Structure formats: C-alpha cells, structure tokens
Amino acid sequence: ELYTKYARVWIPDPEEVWKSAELLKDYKPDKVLQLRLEKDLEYCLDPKELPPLRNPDILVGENDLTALSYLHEPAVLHNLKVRFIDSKLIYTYCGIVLVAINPYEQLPIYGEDIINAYSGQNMGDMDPHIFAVAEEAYKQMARDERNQSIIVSGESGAGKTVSAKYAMRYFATVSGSANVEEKVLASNPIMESIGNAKTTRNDNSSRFGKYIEIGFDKRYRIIGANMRTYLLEKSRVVFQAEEERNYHIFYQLCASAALPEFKTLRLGNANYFHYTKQGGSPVIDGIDDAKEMVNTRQACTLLGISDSYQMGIFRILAGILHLGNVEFASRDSDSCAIPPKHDPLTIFCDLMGVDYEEMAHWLCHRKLATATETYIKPISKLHAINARDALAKHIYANLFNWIVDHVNKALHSTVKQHSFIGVLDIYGFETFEINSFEQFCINYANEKLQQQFNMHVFKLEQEEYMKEQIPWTLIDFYDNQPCINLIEAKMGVLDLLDEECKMPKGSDDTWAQKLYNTHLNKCALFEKPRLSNKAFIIKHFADKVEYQCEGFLEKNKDTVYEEQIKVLKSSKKFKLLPELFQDSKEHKKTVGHQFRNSLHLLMETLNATTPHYVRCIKPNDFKFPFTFDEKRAVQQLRACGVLETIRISAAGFPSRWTYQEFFSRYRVLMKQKDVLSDRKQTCKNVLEKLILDKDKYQFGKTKIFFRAGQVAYLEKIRADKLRAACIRIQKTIRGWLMRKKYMRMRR
Amino acid sequence: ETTALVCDNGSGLVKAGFAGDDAPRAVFPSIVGRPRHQGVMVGMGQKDSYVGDEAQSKRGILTLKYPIEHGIITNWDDMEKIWHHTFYNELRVAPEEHPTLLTEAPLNPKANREKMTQIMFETFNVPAMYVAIQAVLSLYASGRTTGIVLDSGDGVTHNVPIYEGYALPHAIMRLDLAGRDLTD
Ligand SMILES: Nc1ncnc2c1ncn2[C@@H]1O[C@H](COP(=O)(O)OP(=O)(O)NP(=O)(O)O)[C@@H](O)[C@H]1O
Ligand SMILES: Nc1ncnc2c1ncn2[C@@H]1O[C@H](COP(=O)(O)OP(=O)(O)O)[C@@H](O)[C@H]1O
Ligand SMILES: [Mg+2]
Ligand SMILES: [Mg+2]
Ligand SMILES: [Mg+2]
C-alpha cells in the first residue's frame, strides 16, 4: 500500500494544527502505527481514518495549490506556510481564486516595472500577483464588452482595502491618466467612519458591502468611478452586544463635543447616551476618536461636502443620540406618555427644529385612516420604544445613503461610461462564541456568494472539459441550494421570524418552538443543540454554527410611523433633514426583508457580471511582520471557503499534465522498447501499465488529467526505482575502487 | 406578488381590502335597491338594481333590502351581486388571481358556509379560500392570545372565550339582539 517504510504522514497536534511524522514501520491491515518525528512516538490508528499522507517534495511550494497531488488541510497549510515564511511570497492561486496573505510589511513588488511586466500576460505566464488578476479582468473586458468584477473576501484587517487600492492603481497605470484613485482613497475615511464598528474580535470591522465601479470609455481610458453600498447592518445603531461599539462616527462626535463648533449640540461623554452606552466599552485602545474626527472632516472637505452640510450631518447624529435618551412612562398596560418638560426631547426638538408638542404627541400615539374616517389611538411603552428605535435606524440609513450620494457626485464624470470593472469589498463567513441576527445575515449573504462562486467554477470546468473533449459527466456539481432554501424559502427561518414579529405575544421561545416544529426532523442541515431549547444550529458550507434566538425579535422589528416622518419633513430649522427623506410599504418591512432585498440587488449586480475572486487571510492576530500562525490561518482558510473549494476540487480531476512535461518527467519509467517518437501514444500505452484503473485518469486532447492520488503514486514509484538504480550503480563503483586498491595490494 | 383578499360580510357595512394593509379600502353598506316607481323619461339609462352607495344615494325611489339577516344570508342572488360589486367595482381586482378570506359569526347554519364556498369556487373561480370566525379575529386585532371577546355588529351578538389560543366551544354564547333591532 502507500503506507510503506519511509513514508510520511501528517498527524494532528494541539499546538500547531498538524505536524509531520515519518512512518517508522510499514503498515498492514492493523491497529498500530510506529511513527518518527522531526523524536519517537507510537500513534493509535482508530475509528476510520488513515493519517493524511504527505505530498512528494517536488510538489511542495508550487504556485498553484491545485498542483498538489494530495489535497487536504495540512498540505495546503504547509504550502502557504513555506511560501510565506521562506519565500516571502504573499500570493498563491487556488484554482481560479487568488489567496493573499497580509504581510504587515511593505514590499517592493508593486513597482511600475512589474506592472508593465504583467501587462498583456496571461495567468499561466507569470507568478501570481494581484496585478495578474487585474490584468485578467482588463483583458476579459477588452475581448468582450461584458463588464468584469473583482471580489475580495475575508475577515476585516486581512488587507482588502490595500488589495483594491493596488488593483485600481494597476488600471490607472495601464490606461494612463483623471485622478480617480486619489479621490477614491480620500473617500475611505468617511466610509470607514460611518460604516465601521468595533466588534468583539476586531476593531474597524466593516458592516456593509462596498462596490466601486471603475468606468471606462471606448478607448479604455479611466473615465471615473461610481460607488454603491449594500447589506448595511442597520440594527447596530440601536443595540450592541457586550464589548461592542456603535458605528465609529458616534464616538468621534461625542469626543469632539468640547470643541467650539459642537457646543450647540449639548453632547455628553459617550456613556451618557443610551445607544453608545450599552456596549460596555467606550474607548478603543490605540485610537484617538477626537483625532479621527479631524481626518473625517478633512476627507469631507476634500470630497467637497460644504461645512454647512458637515454641521448638518453632525446635527442629525446628535439628534439620533438625544432621541435615544427619550424615556416613556407607561400610564397603562396599553398607554404611555413622555414625562413633562423632558430634557432629551426638548434638546432633540431644539436641534431638529420641530414643535415639541408634535413630537411629544406622535411619539406616543399612532394614526390609522379608513378612506372616510381617521382614528388616533395610544400605543404601549414597548411599541413606543420599538418605534423610536425604528425612527433612529431610518434616519441613520437615510443619512448614510445621502453621504454616499454626495460622494458619488464627487466621483462621477460626465463622459458616458462604455463599460466598467467593479471591485466588491465584502465580509467573510463569521463565527463567534455568541452568534446573533447580524452573524445570521452575514452567513446568509456568504451562502449566496458561495453558491454563485461554485456555479461559476462549475461553468468554467464544463468549458475546459469541452476544450479537451472529455465527457462532462465525470464532474459533479456541489450545491448549497438546500441551505439557502432552509434560510430563505417560505416557512424558512427568516419567514417564520417575520411571521413571529407580527404575531401577537410573539417571543423568542415561541419562535424557537416554531423552528423546532417545522425543521427539527425534516432537514439534515438544521439541528437543535443538545442541552438548550433557545438555540438552533445550521450546517453552513464552512462549518456548523449555533445561533441564539434570544436577540432576534428585537433586532428584526422595523416599523416607522408616517406621522413621525412628516414631523421631521416639516422641519425648517435646517435644510438637510427634509432633504434626506425626499425619496410606503417599505416602512412596514422588517430588517430581515430589507436585507434579503439588498442581497437580491447585489446578486443581480454580480450575476450580470463575470467575477474574479480574491481571498484575503490574516496570518496572526498581533500584526507581527511575516509571522504565521497555523491555528489562526486554518480558521481563516475555513471561513474563506478555500478549504471547501479544495475539497470540491479534490473530487474530480484536480491534477493536469501536458503530455510533453509528463513524458519529460517519467522517461525513467519507460523502457526504451516502448518510447515512440509520438509522445502521446507512448503515454497512453504506459499509464495503463503503471496505473490499473482507466477511471483514475483521462486522456485529454493536449493534457493528461489525473485524480488526486495518482501523480504522487507515480512520483513514489519513480523515486524508488531511481533509488534502486543509484544503489546498484554505486555499489558497482565502490566495488571497482576496492578492486583497484586490491590491485595495488598485489602491486 | 399575490395578496389575499380579506372580506367581512357583516350585516350593514361590507368592508373589504387586501391582506397586510391596515384598513379596508372598500367600505359600503350591504344593501340592494330596486326601483319601485313607474319610470317616465325615455332614454335615461335606468338600471335594474343598485348596490351599496348607489342605493344609498337614490334611496328615495328604491325599496332597500338587506341580503343578510342575523348573519344568515337569506337571499343569494343579491349576495352574489354584492360580491360581484365588491371585487369588480370596489377593489377592481380579478378574483381568479387572489386567495379570498371570508368571515362569519359562530353557531350559524352550515348551509351558509357550503353555499359561500360553492359560490366562491364555481362562479368567481377564486383559487383558494377560507372561512374565519368573527370573534377570533378581534384577538388578532387586539394583540392578545387570551380573553372573552364580546362582539356586536348589525344582527348577531356573540361571546367567545379564548385562552392561550384554544377556543372553548361549549361556552360560546350567541344573541340576536344587536344593532338592527335597536333601530326598529
Ligand atoms: N499586500 C499588502 N502589502 C502590504 N501591507 C499590506 C498588504 N495587505 C495588507 N497590508 C497591511 O494590512 C493592514 C490593513 O490593511 P487594509 O487594506 O488597510 O485593511 P483594512 O483597512 O482593515 N480593511 P478591512 O480588512 O475590511 O478592515 C495595513 O497595515 C496594511 O499595510
Ligand atoms: N358610532 C356608532 N354608534 C352606534 N352605533 C353604530 C355606530 N356605528 C355603527 N353603528 C351600528 O352598528 C351596526 C354596524 O356595525 P358593523 O360592525 O358595521 O356590523 P357588521 O359587523 O355586521 O359589519 C349598525 O347597526 C350601525 O347602525
Ligand atoms: Mg486598515
Ligand atoms: Mg475594511
Ligand atoms: Mg362584524
């Protein structure tokens, strides 16, 4: 079998996810392996698994992880670890995907000489680099007018922004120049301020998907850029878990409060306001939010938001903060009122230019109109609080869309866009010790993107199989559609959640009970956690994730009362507040439904386009330059779906050889009888002797296709033959030389 | 996409609309008038019968009939006229495209439900429908899973106790007092 003496295997280890071991006695079918480690060990072979075999060293370090014959977690982690630590290469293909590892260090590779070296070169020609993706997108756009996308995924801090920056720098250099890249880089401070938040694992996490469209003219000169956004995490504006913050802008604003300009806002310290206070952790270590405010305002100026509009924005945000302090006294089970002369509401009305008496009335009552007849009726303290928080979320989302539209006004250019290349910065799959509605939406968006990826890769495989005239049937599609239908179908988790929001006396216990009713035993992907009746498990593409129900109903509710909008629309103190709304069923939509719609807009934008994928990984938490941590990276390779992409490629024909290079490699196996001057027929004759099963390889037109094991098996038998020949020859040489010394001994 | 129609036949007012909007956009009395005087002027566009607000506007010259008395539909052709008027004129929606949800008082004859369903499937060709108890819907409307609902329209009054979503059908009381006989 493959497990012979002097084989090598990966064995699991607590402190680095896998470690190498040499098989010290060959294995036979049973329960024992004698292993030797770089010392001496015995390892129980136990159900069943044999330990993962190790690739022959010729394969280790190659530019494409799918060139490996054994494809599995430790071989991938080893090839990335050696290339990064030893070579200090940071880019590696996986199939179509480019894997990019954050070095936390500057590098020379982005010089314009290398930009020129990549230009016009196909991916085969040159070692992988982000420019090799940009150039591919550029030439795909040139061949066929179809727009192109570049898609960048990973945990925040993996370097997605710098990857996009160099990607567009490539376009700027190859097209020549129109000063887009400066404006786009100058926009990042405000989008990071309004759109990023501290999270339990990570500072400056981005809670939205940002899509930059670089537009080209008929010459493929850079015209200008357009910016869209999707999947904003609205629910964070009003609620945070422990050790989380609100969006940075709120804390930059609060810390500024001592400044002369912001005096009129009557801002307090960041733990005074209810929306900032909840998270527990007002201060990020190593950031001065008061200083960050200056960079934010500077970038507003550079993008030409007038200081009138800037003071409008900070007015609106202080409005949201003061609004969050408004506190309702329940005068009945079905009625509430705002205590008289309420200072939070007095300051909110002063800031926003509205009649105190109208906000005080409409916050506590809601209005219904039959076509002839209208009734004003009170609402409980719970509905009043839910409606105040839905108003704060609706104001924030409209301010965000407004700042994005005023950035777009600065980035657009008047030339008609012939076609565009677009770059999508999006968060990757996410798992924490506690998982919640935010993580549920993020993992559903990632299930959608991973489906569209798998189906693009399947299309490209069917094309390559046509190109080599191999039957299509050999490749099977791997479809995560059952998990999408689990999450988003009617009677899905989101559907039952939107039902339980309107249901009377809905609660997280009865929602969970409806979940267990519908899907506890009907779906393999939904499971109940053994010890709890308040949580549920979904088997996602990457991993099983356990979600707690306990938050979702509060986070899912949006309903905004028209009268409360019309109060703000009536404001005349300042012009931004009526401008935000200027724009009915949407006011009834839950956060989950707005999310599913923004995700369908995103999938429409992407399906129109031809994607190219980049995955970013963050090799260590502490930002040490060129250090690597196996237990961090295995987590991020799992979350980026690189490991499942490799698993899906390991079934099929992952290893592909040109007949020329195959023959060059394995002449040693061929007997001089059977070497023809046609290489291809020699190879077809020989491989059927060397490998018994025709299933294990396919003869393409120009390339030989192997299943995973076979190329390493041929390398093993080659090396063992060459060992036998070497030993036999060298014993002959040594024998002659001792015979010569014997001839001396006679002489 | 497709949104159910919701219709409550009552006595007196019809009120109807689309599911998931908050108040009915058709409301009108369930009344049918037929003219009783000799028509004199030739060429007037004079009409065989009037429904709803038409029969309120012209009521000086009409005999007004209620097709529903004490929640029982006594006259079926006029009830078909009232539904035809509701779907085509008031909502301007073709009923083949929408499930319909219909409301009834408890403890009234079964023939009323059999005929309501035979009519909605055979003449209107409504793809799907349901018949709901009037009192049960007032709990959905008031945000509760528990309570004794007291309901009075025109015609029938009834009490229905409900506790955590279970009805108690032996305790349902029904009374014919309400609303029209106050006017008489
Ligand atoms: N290819 C690279 N070369 C050099 N430094 C890099 C590279 N990629 C990332 N970095 C460093 O990684 C850090 C963060 O990178 P950046 O692109 O700014 O990510 P980011 O701002 O955190 N966006 P996000 O990951 O969504 O939070 C900086 O110190 C960068 O210098
Ligand atoms: N404001 C009111 N005060 C007293 N009686 C009313 C009022 N409005 C309607 N009614 C009476 O109640 C009855 C209508 O109630 P309604 O709920 O529309 O009946 P149904 O439930 O059969 O549709 C009529 O008899 C009408 O005269
Ligand atoms: Mg950064
Ligand atoms: Mg970022
Ligand atoms: Mg009624």
Q: How much helix, strand and coil, in percent to the nearest 5, is found in chain B?
A: 30, 30, 40
CA distance A725 to A77: 34
Q: Are A648 and A478 in contact (CB under 8 A)?
A: yes
Q: Are A353 and A571 in contact (CB under 8 A)?
A: yes
List the alpha helices (DSSP H) in A227-325: 248-256, 274-277, 289-302, 307-324
Label residue B127 left, alpha or beta by phi (over 0 means left) and psi (-120 to 50 means alpha): alpha
- Measure the CA dihedral A185/A191/A192/A197, to 10°: -170
Bridge pairing between strands A148-153 and A419-426: parallel
What residues form DSSP beta bridges with A32? A44
Q: What are the Cα distances from residue A618, in Å, to A63, A130, A153, A192, B178?
A: 19, 16, 12, 19, 74
3-state DSSP assignment of residue B138: helix
CA distance A410 to A412: 6
Method used to determine the 3D structure:
cryo-EM
Task: State the fold for domain B29-69.
Answer: Actin; Chain A, domain 2 (2.30.36)
3-state DSSP assignment of residue A151: strand
Give backbone dihedrals phi and psi of A167, rounded to 5 degrees, phi first.
Answer: -65, -40
Nearest to A651 by CA among A479, A475, A461: A475
A503 Cβ contact list (under 8 Å, min separation 6): A510
List the alpha helices (DSSP H) in A468-587: 481-488, 493-502, 508-519, 552-556, 562-569, 576-581
Both tokens of residue A298?
Answer: 């500077």
3-state DSSP assignment of residue A21: strand
Q: Are A74 and A18 in contact (CB under 8 A)?
A: yes
Breaks (C-N over 2.5 A) in chain A follow: 29, 38, 47, 177, 583
Q: Buried (b) or exposed (e) across A80-96, using 16+ Cβ within 10 A?
A: bbebbeeeebbbbbbbb
* Ligand 5 centre distance from Cα of residue B66 (Å): 15
Q: Which CATH architecture has domain B2-28+70-135?
A: 2-Layer Sandwich (3.30)
Residue with token string 């094309």: A463
Residue closest via CA to ligand 2's atom 5 equals B179
CA distance B9 to B32: 14
DSSP 8-state secondary structure symbol assigned to residue A231: -
Taking residue A432's Cβ as centre, other Cβ atoms within 10 Å add up to 13
CA distance A617 to A521: 37
* Ligand 3 centre distance from Cα of residue A160 (Å): 9
CA distance A536 to A492: 13
Whether A202 lines ligand 1, by a CB cut-off of 6 Å, is no
Q: What are the Cα distances from residue A158, in Å, to A195, A206, A446, A585?
A: 17, 12, 17, 39
3-state DSSP assignment of residue A250: helix
Catalytic residues of A: 156-157, 161, 202, 205-206, 428, 430
* Ligand 4 centre distance from Cα of residue A377 (Å): 46
Both tokens of residue A485?
Answer: 């239908």
Q: Are A99 and A619 in contact (CB under 8 A)?
A: no
DSSP 8-state secondary structure symbol assigned to residue A5: T
Residue with token string 């099983």: A544
B22 Cβ contact list (under 8 Å, min separation 6): A368
3-state DSSP assignment of residue A719: helix
| DSSP string over A57-103 | TTTTT-SBGGG-SS-SHHHHHHHHHHIIIII---EEEETTEEEEE--
- CB nearest to B140's CB, from A369, A504, A588: A504
Residues composing chain B: 184
Bridge pairing between strands B5-8 and B100-104: parallel
CA distance A621 to A625: 11
CA distance A252 to A284: 11
Give chain B's count of helices (H) and strands (E). Answer: 4, 14
Q: What are the Cα distances from residue A224, in Å, to A186, A300, A734, B22, B157?
A: 14, 19, 74, 46, 71
CATH number at residue A525: 1.20.58.530
CA B175 to chain centre: 19
Bridge pairing between strands A373-378 and A365-370: antiparallel
Angle between helices A180-195 and A289-302 (to 10 degrees): 140
Whether B10 lines ligand 2, by a CB cut-off of 6 Å, is yes
What residues form DSSP beta bridges with B101? B6, B130
| Ligand 1 atom, smallest distance to A206 CA | 26
Domain containing residue A453:
443-556
Nearest to A259 by CA among A223, A228, A224, A296: A296
Whether B103 lines ligand 2, by a CB cut-off of 6 Å, is no
* Resolution (Å) of this entry: 2.9
Bridge pairing between strands B147-152 and B13-18: unpaired
